[PDB]
mmCIF file of C-alpha atoms and ligand atoms in Angstrom:
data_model
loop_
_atom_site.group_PDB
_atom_site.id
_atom_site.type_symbol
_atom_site.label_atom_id
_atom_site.label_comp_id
_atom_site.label_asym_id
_atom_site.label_seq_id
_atom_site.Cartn_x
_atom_site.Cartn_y
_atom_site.Cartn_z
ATOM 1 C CA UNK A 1 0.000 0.000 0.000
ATOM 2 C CA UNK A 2 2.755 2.397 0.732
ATOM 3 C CA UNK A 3 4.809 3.065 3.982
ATOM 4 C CA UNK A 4 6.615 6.484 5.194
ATOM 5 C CA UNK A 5 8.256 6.263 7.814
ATOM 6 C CA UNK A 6 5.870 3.527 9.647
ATOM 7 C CA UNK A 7 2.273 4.490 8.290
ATOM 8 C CA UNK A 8 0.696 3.111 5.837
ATOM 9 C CA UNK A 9 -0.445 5.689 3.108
ATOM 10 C CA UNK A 10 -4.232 3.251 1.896
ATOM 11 C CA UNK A 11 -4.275 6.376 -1.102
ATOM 12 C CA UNK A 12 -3.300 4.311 -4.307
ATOM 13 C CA UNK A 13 -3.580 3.586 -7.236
ATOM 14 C CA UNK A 14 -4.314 7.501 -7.588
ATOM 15 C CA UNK A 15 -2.060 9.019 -5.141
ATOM 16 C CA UNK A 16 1.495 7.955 -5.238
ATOM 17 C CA UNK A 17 5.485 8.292 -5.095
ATOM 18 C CA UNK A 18 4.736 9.912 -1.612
ATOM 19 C CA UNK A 19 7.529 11.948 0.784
ATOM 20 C CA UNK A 20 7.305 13.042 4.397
ATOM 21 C CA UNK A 21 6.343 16.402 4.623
ATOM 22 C CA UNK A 22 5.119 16.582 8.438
ATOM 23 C CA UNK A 23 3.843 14.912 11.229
ATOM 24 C CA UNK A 24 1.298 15.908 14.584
ATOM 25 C CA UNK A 25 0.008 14.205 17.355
ATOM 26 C CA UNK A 26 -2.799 11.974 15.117
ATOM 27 C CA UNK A 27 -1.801 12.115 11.518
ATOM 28 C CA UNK A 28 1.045 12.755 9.264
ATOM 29 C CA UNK A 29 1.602 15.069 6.063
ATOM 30 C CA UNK A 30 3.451 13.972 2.745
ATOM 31 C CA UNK A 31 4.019 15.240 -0.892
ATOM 32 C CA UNK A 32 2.641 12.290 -3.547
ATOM 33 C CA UNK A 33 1.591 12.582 -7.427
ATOM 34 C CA UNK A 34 -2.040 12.626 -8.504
ATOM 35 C CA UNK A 35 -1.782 9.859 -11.835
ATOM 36 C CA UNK A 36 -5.528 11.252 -12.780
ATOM 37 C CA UNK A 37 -4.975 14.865 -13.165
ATOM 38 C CA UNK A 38 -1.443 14.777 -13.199
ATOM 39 C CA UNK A 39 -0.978 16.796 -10.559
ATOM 40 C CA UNK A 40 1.089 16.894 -7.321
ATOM 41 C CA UNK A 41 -0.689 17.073 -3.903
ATOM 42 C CA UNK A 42 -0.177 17.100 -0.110
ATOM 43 C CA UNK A 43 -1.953 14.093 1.987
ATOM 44 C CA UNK A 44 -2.965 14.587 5.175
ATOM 45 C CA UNK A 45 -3.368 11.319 6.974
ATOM 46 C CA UNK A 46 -5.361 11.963 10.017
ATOM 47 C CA UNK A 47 -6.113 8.924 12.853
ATOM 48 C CA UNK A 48 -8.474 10.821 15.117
ATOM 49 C CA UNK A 49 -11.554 8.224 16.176
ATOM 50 C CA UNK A 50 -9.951 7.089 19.510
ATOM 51 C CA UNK A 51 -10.481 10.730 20.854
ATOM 52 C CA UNK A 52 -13.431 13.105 21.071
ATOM 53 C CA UNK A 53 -11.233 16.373 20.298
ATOM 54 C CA UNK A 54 -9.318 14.959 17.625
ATOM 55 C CA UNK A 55 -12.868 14.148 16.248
ATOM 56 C CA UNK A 56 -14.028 17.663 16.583
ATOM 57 C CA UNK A 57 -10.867 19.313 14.882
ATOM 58 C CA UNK A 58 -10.956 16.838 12.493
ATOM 59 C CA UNK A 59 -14.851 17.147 11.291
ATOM 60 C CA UNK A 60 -14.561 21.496 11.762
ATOM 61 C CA UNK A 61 -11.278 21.959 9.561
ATOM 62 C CA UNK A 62 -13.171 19.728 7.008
ATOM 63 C CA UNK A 63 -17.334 21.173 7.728
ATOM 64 C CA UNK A 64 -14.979 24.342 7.056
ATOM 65 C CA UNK A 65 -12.323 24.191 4.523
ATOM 66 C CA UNK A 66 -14.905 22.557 1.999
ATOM 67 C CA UNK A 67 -17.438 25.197 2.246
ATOM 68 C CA UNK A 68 -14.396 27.756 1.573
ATOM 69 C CA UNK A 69 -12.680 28.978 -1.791
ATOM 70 C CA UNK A 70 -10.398 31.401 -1.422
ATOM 71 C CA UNK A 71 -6.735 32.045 -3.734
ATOM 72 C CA UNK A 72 -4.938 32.709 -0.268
ATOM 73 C CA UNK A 73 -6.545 29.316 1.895
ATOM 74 C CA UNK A 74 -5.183 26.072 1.148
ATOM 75 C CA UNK A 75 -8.607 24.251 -0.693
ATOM 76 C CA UNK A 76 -9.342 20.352 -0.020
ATOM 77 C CA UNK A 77 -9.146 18.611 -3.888
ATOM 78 C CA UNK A 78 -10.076 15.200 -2.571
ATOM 79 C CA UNK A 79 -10.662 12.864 0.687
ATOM 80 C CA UNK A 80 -10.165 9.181 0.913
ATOM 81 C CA UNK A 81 -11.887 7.124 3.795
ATOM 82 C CA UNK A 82 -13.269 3.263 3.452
ATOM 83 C CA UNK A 83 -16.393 2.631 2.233
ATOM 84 C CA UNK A 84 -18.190 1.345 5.823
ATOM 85 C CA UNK A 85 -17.928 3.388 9.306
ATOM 86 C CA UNK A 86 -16.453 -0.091 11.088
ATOM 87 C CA UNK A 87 -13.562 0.064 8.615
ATOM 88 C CA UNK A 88 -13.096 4.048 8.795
ATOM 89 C CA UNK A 89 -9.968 3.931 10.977
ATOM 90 C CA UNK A 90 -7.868 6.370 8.872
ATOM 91 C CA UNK A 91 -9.429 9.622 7.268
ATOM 92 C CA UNK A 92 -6.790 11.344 3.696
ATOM 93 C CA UNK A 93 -6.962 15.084 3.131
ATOM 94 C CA UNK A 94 -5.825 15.357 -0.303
ATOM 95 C CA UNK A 95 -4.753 19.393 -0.795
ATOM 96 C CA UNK A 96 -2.683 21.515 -3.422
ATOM 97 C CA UNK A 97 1.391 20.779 -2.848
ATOM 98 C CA UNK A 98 3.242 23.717 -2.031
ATOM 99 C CA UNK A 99 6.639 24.237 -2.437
ATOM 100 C CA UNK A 100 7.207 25.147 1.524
ATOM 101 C CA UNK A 101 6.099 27.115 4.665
ATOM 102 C CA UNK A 102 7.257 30.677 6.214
ATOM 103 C CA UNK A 103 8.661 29.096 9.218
ATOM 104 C CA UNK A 104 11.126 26.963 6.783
ATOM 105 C CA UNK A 105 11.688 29.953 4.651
ATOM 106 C CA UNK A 106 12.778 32.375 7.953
ATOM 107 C CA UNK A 107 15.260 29.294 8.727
ATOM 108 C CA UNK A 108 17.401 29.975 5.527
ATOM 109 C CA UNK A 109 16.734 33.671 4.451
ATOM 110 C CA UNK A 110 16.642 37.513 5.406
ATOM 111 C CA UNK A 111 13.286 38.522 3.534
ATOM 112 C CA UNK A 112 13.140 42.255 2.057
ATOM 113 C CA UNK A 113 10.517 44.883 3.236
ATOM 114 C CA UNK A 114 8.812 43.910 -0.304
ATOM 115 C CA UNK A 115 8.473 40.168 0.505
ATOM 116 C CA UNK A 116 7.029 41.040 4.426
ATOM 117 C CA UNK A 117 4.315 43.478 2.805
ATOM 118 C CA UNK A 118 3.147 41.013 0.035
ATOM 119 C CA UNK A 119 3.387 38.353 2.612
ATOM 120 C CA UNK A 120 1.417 40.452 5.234
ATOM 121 C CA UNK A 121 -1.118 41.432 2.644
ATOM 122 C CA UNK A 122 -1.864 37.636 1.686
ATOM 123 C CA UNK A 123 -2.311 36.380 5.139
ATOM 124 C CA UNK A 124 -4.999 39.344 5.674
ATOM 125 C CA UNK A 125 -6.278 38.904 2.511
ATOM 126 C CA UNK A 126 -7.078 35.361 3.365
ATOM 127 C CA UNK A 127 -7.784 36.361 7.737
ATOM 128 C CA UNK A 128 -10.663 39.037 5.661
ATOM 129 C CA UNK A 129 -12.116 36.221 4.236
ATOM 130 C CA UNK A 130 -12.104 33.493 7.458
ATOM 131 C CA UNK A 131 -13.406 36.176 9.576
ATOM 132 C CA UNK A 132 -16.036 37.695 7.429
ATOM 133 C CA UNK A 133 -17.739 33.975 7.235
ATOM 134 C CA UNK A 134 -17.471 33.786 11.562
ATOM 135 C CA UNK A 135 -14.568 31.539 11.597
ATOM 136 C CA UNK A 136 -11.649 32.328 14.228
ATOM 137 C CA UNK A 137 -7.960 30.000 12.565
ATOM 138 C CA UNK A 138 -6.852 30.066 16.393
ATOM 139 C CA UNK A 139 -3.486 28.661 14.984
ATOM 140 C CA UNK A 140 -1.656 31.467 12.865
ATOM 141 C CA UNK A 141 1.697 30.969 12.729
ATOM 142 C CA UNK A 142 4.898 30.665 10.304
ATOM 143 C CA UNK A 143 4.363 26.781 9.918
ATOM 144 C CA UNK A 144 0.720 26.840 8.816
ATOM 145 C CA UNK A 145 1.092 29.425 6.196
ATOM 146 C CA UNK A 146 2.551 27.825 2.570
ATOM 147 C CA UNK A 147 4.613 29.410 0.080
ATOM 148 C CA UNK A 148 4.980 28.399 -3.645
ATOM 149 C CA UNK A 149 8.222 29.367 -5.592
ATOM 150 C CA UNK A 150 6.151 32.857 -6.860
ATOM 151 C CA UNK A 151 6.034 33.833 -3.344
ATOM 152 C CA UNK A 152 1.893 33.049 -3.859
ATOM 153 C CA UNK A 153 1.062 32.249 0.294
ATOM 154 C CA UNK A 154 -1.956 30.455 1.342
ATOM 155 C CA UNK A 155 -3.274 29.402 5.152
ATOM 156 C CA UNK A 156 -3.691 25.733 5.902
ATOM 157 C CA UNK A 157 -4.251 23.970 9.476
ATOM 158 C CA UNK A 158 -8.251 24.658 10.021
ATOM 159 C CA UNK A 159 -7.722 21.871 12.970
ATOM 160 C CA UNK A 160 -7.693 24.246 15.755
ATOM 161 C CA UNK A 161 -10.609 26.726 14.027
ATOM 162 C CA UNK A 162 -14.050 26.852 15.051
ATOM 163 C CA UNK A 163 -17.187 29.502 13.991
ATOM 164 C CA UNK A 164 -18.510 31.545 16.418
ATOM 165 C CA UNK A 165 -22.256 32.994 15.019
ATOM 166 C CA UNK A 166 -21.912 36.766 16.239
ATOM 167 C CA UNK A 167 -26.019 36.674 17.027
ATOM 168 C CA UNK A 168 -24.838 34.483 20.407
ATOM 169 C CA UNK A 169 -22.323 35.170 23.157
ATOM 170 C CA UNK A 170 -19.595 33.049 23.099
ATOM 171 C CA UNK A 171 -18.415 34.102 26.566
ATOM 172 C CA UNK A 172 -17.403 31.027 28.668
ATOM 173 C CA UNK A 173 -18.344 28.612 25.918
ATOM 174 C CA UNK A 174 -14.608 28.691 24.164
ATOM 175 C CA UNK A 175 -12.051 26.272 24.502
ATOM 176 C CA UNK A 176 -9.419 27.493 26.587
ATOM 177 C CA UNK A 177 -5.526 26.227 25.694
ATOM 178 C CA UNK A 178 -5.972 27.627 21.980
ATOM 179 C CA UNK A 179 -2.788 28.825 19.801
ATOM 180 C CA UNK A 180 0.972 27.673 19.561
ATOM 181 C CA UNK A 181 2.430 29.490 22.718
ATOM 182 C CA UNK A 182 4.301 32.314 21.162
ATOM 183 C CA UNK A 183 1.297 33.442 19.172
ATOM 184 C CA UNK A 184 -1.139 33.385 22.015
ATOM 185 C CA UNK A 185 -2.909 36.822 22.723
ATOM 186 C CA UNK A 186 -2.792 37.620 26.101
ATOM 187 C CA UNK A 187 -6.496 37.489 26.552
ATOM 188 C CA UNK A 188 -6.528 33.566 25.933
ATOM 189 C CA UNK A 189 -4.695 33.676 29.233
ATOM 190 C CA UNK A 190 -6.813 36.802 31.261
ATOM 191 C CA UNK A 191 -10.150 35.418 29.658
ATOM 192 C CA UNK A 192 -9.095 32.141 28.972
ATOM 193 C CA UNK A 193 -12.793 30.978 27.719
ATOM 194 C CA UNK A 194 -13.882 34.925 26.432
ATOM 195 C CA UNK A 195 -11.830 35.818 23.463
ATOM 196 C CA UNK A 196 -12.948 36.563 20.226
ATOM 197 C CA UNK A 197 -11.139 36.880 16.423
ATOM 198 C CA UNK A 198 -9.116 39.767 17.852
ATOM 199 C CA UNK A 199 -6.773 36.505 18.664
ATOM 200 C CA UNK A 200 -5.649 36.173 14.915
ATOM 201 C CA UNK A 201 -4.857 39.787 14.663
ATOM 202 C CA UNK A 202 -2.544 39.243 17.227
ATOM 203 C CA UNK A 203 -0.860 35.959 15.933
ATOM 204 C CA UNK A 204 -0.501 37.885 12.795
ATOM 205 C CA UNK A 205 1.008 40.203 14.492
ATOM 206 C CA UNK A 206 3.687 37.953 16.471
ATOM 207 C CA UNK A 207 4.193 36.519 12.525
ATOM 208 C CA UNK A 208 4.710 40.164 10.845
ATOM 209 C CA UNK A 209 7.906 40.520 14.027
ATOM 210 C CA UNK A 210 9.241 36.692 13.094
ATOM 211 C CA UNK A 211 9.492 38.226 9.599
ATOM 212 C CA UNK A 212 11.206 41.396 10.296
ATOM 213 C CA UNK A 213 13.772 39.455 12.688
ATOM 214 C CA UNK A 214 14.213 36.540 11.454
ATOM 215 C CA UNK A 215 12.756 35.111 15.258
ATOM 216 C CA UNK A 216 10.259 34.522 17.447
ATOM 217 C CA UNK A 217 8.981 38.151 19.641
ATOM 218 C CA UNK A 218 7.647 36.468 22.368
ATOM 219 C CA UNK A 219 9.771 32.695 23.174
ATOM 220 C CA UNK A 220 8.009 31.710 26.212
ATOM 221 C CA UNK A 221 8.770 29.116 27.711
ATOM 222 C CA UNK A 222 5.444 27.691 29.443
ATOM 223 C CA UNK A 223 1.727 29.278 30.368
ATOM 224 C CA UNK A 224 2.620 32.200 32.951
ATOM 225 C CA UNK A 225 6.103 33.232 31.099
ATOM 226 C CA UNK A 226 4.532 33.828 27.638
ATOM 227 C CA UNK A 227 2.735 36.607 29.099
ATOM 228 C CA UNK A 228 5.630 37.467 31.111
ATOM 229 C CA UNK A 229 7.300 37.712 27.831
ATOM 230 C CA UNK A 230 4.822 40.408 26.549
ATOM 231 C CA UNK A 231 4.641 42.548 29.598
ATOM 232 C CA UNK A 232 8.706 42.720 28.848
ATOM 233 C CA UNK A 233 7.732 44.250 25.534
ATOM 234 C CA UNK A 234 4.310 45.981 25.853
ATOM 235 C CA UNK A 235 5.131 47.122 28.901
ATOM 236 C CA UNK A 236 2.613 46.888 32.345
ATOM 237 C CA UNK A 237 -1.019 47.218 31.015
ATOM 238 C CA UNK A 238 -2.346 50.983 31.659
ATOM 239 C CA UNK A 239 -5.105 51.241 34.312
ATOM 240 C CA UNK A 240 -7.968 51.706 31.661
ATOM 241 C CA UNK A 241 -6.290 48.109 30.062
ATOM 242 C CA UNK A 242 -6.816 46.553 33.603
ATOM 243 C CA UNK A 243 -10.146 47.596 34.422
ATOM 244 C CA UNK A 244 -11.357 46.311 31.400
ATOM 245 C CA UNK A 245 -10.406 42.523 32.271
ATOM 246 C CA UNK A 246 -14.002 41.634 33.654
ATOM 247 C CA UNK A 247 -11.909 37.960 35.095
ATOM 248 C CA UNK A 248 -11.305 38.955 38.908
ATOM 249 C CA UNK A 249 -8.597 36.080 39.565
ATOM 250 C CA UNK A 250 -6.658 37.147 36.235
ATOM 251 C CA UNK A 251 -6.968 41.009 36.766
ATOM 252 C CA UNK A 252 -5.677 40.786 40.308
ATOM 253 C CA UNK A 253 -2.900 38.310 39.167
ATOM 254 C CA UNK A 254 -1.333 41.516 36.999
ATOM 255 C CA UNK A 255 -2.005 44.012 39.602
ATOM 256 C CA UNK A 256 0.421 41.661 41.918
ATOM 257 C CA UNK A 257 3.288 42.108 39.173
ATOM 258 C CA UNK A 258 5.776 44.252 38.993
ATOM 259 C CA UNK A 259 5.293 47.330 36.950
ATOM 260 C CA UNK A 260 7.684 46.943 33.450
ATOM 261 C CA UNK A 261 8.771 50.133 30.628
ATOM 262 C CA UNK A 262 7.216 49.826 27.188
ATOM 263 C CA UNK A 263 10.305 48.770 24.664
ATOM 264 C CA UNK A 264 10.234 51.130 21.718
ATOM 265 C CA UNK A 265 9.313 49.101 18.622
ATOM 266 C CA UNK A 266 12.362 50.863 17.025
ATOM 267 C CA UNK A 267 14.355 49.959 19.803
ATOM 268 C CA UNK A 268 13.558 46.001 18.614
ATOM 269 C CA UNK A 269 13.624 46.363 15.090
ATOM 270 C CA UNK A 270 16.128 49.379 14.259
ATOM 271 C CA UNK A 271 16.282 48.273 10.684
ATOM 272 C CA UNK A 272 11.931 48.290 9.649
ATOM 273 C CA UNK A 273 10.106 50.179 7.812
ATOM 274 C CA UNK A 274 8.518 52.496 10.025
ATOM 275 C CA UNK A 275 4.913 51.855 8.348
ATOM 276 C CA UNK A 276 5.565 48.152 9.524
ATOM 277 C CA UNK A 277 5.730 49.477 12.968
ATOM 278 C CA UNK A 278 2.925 51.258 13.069
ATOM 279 C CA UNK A 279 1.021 48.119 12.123
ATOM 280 C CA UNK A 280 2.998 46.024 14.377
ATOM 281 C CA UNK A 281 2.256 48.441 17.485
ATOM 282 C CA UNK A 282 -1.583 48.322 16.057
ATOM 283 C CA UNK A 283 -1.400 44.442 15.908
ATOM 284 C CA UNK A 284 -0.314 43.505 19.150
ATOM 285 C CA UNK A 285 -2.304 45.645 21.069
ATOM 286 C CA UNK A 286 -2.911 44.214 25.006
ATOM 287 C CA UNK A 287 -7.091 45.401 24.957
ATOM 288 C CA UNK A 288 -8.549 43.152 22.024
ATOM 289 C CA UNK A 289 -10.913 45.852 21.847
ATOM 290 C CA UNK A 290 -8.462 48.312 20.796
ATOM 291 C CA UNK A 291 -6.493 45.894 18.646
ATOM 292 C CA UNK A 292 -6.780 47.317 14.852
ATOM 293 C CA UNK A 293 -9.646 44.580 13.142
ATOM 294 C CA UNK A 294 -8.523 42.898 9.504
ATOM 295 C CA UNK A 295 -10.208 45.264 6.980
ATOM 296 C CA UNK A 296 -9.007 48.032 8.877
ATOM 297 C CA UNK A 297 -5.069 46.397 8.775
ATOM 298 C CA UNK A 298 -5.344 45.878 4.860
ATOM 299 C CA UNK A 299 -6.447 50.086 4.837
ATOM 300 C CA UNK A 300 -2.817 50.838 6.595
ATOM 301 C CA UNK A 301 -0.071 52.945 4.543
ATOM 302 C CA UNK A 302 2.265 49.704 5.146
ATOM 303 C CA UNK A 303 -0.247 47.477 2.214
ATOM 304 C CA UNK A 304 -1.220 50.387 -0.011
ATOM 305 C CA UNK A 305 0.357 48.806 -2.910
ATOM 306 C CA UNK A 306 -1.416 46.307 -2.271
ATOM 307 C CA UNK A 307 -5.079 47.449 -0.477
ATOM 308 C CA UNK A 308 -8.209 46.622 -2.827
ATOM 309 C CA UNK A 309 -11.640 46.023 -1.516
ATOM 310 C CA UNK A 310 -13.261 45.237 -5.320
ATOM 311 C CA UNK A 311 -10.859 42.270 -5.570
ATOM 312 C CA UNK A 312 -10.676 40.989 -2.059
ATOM 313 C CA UNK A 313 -13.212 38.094 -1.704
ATOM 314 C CA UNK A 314 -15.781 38.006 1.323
ATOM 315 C CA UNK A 315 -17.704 34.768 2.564
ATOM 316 C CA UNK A 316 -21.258 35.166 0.567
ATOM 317 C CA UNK A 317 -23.018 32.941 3.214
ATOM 318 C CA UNK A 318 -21.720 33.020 6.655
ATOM 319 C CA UNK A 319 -21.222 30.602 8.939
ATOM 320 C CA UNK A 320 -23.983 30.137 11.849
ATOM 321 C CA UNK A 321 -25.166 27.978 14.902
ATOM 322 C CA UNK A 322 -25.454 24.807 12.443
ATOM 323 C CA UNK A 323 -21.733 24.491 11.841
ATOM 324 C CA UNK A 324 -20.353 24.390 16.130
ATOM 325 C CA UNK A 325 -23.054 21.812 16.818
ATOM 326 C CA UNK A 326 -20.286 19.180 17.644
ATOM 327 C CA UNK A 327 -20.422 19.005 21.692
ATOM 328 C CA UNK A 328 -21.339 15.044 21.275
ATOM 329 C CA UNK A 329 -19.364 11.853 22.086
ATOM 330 C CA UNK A 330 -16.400 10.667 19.535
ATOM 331 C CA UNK A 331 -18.700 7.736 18.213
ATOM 332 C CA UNK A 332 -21.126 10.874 16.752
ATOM 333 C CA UNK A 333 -18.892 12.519 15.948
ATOM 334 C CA UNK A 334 -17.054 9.998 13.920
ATOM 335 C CA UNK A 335 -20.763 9.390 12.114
ATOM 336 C CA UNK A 336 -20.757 12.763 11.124
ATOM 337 C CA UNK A 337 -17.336 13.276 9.668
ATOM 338 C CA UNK A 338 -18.280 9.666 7.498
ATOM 339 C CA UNK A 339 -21.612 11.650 6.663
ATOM 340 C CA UNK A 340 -19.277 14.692 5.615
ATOM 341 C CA UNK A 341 -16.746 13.085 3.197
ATOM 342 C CA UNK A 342 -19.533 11.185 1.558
ATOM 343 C CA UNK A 343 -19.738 13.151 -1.476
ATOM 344 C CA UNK A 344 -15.824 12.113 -2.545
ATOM 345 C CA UNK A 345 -17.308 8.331 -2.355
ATOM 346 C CA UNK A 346 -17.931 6.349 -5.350
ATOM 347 C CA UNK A 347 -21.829 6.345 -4.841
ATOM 348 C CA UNK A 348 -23.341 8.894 -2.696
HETATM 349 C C1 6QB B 1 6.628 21.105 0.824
HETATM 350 N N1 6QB B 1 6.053 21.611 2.073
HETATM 351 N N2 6QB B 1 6.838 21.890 3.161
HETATM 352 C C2 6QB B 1 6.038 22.302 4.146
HETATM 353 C C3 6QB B 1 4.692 22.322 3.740
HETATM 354 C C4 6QB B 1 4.737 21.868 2.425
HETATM 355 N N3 6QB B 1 3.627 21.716 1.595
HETATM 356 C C5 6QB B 1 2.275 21.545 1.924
HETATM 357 N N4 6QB B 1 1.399 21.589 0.915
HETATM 358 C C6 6QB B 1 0.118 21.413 1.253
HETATM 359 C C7 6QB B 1 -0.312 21.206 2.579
HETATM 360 C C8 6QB B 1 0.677 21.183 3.581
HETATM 361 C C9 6QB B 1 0.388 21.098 5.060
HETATM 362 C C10 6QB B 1 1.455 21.223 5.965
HETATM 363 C C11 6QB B 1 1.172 21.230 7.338
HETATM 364 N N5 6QB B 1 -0.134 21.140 7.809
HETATM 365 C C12 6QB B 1 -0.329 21.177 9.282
HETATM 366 C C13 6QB B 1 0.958 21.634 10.018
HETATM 367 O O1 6QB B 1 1.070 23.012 10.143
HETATM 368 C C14 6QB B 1 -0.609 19.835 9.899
HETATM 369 C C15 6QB B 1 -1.651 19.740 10.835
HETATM 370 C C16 6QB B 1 -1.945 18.528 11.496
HETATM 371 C C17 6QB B 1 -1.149 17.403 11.214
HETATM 372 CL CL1 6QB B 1 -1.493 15.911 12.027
HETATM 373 C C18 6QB B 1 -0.083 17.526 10.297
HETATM 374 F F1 6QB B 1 0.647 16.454 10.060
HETATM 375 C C19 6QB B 1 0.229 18.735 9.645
HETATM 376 C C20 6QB B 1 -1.216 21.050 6.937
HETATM 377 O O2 6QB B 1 -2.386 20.957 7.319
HETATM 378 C C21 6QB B 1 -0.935 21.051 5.559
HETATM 379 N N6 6QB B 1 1.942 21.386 3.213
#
């Protein structure tokens, strides 16, 4: 059937010739060559059935990525699944191959203020869209945005994304250990089951530094030191920012801290364009209400070469209540993701 590096690949006799791209905790990523439409692709082998969250991520990032179509968010081509829910063991995302990601890229080059800007443009070109149909990524970082050799970018990783219908409050009904550490808004930790999109702004923000430096802003190294991290950038919040964390525990827990200097953004990056900065400062904002919103981050000086609201694609239905109904035990769950992938079955 075809092995890398212990799992099986059950894909053929379309999908072969296949090399490791990536692995996660249920599920592994490799390049392999479409014989049909003579194509390559990316397979996404995920194993999730023997856990209820892995079931969840697994049916959203598909309920989602199939209703989307967007230039600048990786599309699903194909899934491959057996043909009875017994046998279902193993579930193949079959996606567009690109050439690499950003976090590979920043390894093994110094990008130019023209690459950052188109860069920055494409990833809120493609946020515009995500949060204009009620999604929230909740993962933004180097490794889950793709690069093809014409510096083309497109988002992938919908595992850790959910929609949140803005006619209901979402307030204490959000899972709380969301985002890679270093990309984690501070909110996530002061209103750990509260935040809202604002989150992506901010990961895009702790992205738009990694590309100006060549390195993660904020390296934390576990839950309380990530914010730690941020305070010794952003300096202590103001009293206006405290006040408005509604969490007594959390908003007490600063107040106990010592009080920390702002560092100058120029001070960090002596070498950016200052336009960047502005963004940057605009991006990673402490109050998520404060924190500039994605149409108005495209409208910045920094993307004006870029900026275009007549060809900048919108979701035309939006997501609602229907799409987060997924609170329900992994055996449901695993009914509705068979249910879902359907329609790439001989039959249906
Ligand atoms: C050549 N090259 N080098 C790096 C990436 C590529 N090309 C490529 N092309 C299409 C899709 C993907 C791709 C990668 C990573 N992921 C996430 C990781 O961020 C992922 C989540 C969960 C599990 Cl389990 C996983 F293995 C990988 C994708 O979903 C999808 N990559």
């Amino acid at each position: 059937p075809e092995m890398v590096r212990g799992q099986v690949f059950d894909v053929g006799p379309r999908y072969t010739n296949l090399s490791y791209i990536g692995e996660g905790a249920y599920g592994m990523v490799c390049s392999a060559y479409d014989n049909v439409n003579k194509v390559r692709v990316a397979i996404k082998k995920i194993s999730p059935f023997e856990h209820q969250t892995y079931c969840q991520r697994t049916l959203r990032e598909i309920k989602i990525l199939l209703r989307f179509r967007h230039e600048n968010i990786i599309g699903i081509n194909d899934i491959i699944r057996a043909p009875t829910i017994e046998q279902m063991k193993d579930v193949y995302i079959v996606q567009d191959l690109m050439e690499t990601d950003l976090y590979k890229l920043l390894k093994t080059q110094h990008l130019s203020n023209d690459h950052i800007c188109y860069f920055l443009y494409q990833i809120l070109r493609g946020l515009k869209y995500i949060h204009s149909a009620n999604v929230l990524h909740r993962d933004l970082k180097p490794s889950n945005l793709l690069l093809n050799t014409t510096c083309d970018l497109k988002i992938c990783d919908f595992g850790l994304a959910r929609v949140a219908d803005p006619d209901h409050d979402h307030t204490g009904f959000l899972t709380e250990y969301v985002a890679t550490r270093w990309y984690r808004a501070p909110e996530i930790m002061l209103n750990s089951k509260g935040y809202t999109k604002s989150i992506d702004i901010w990961s895009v923000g702790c992205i738009l530094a990694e590309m100006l430096s060549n390195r993660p802003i904020f390296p934390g190294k576990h839950y309380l030191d990530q914010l730690n991290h941020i305070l010794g950038i952003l300096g202590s919040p103001s009293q206006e920012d405290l006040n408005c964390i509604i969490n007594l525990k959390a908003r007490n827990y600063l107040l106990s801290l010592p009080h920390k200097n702002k560092v100058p953004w120029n001070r960090l990056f002596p070498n950016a364009d200052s336009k960047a900065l502005d963004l940057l400062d605009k991006m990673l904002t402490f109050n998520p209400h404060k924190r500039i919103e994605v149409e108005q981050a495209l409208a910045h000086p920094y993307l004006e070469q870029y900026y275009d609201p007549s060809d900048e694609p919108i979701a035309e239905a939006p997501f609602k209540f229907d799409m987060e109904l997924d609170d329900l035990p992994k055996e449901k769950l695993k009914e509705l993701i068979f249910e879902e992938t359907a329609r790439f079955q001989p039959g249906y």
